[PDB]
């Protein structure tokens, strides 16, 4: 699971029963560089067929 909001990742990091890693944050504006960071991580996560 990928978390995108800091409220989200703060909820997520308390419970590791759900397999969760690689959380990021873009707040008050989705900046093109932050959306590109999300794009980079999810594309590099898909280039391995581990994740479909």
């Amino acid at each position: 699971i990928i978390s995108i909001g800091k409220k989200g990742n703060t909820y997520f990091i308390r419970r590791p029963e759900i397999p969760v890693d690689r959380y990021f944050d873009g707040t008050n504006l989705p900046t093109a560089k932050e959306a590109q960071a999300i794009a980079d991580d999810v594309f590099s996560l898909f280039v391995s067929e581990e994740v479909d």
Binding site: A32, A35, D40, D41, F43, S44, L45, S48
Partner: protein, 131 residues
């Protein structure tokens, strides 16, 4: 003497103006484009969009995209573009060194694409000192 240039991006429209030449860098070619060009559809990726306006040869570096570059009304659907001299030299060189720090990390085939994109961020950044 020019074309209608529209370099777009997800949340912005970076540089809509008229310029003599367009030297966008694809993977297979750094296709120089200039007025009355026949409609080509390039897959423009990492590299500088060197353009030569008659004032000066102001360069802009784009992280990737696409360009339905046709008859003087082109739309270079760029992923991420930083126009002109908005990029800063010393921070760009330190960013290249940090990209080297991200280049040597780990992990088989999963993370090497992020390593590639960090290297290519550095290739975007080399434009700054060249600007």
């Amino acid at each position: 003497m020019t074309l209608n240039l529209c370099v777009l991006t997800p949340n912005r429209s970076i540089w809509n103006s008229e310029v003599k030449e367009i030297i966008l860098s694809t993977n297979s070619g750094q296709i120089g484009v200039l007025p009355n060009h026949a409609p080509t559809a390039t897959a423009v990726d990492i590299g500088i969009l060197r353009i030569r306006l008659n004032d000066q040869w102001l360069t802009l570096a784009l992280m990737g995209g696409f360009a339905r570059i046709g008859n003087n009304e082109i739309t270079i659907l760029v992923n991420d573009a930083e126009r002109g001299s908005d990029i800063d030299p010393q921070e760009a060189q330190q960013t290249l060194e940090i990209a080297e720090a991200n280049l040597r990390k780990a992990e088989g085939k999963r993370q090497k694409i992020e390593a590639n994109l960090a290297l290519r961020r550095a290739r975007t950044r080399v434009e700054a000192s060249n600007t």
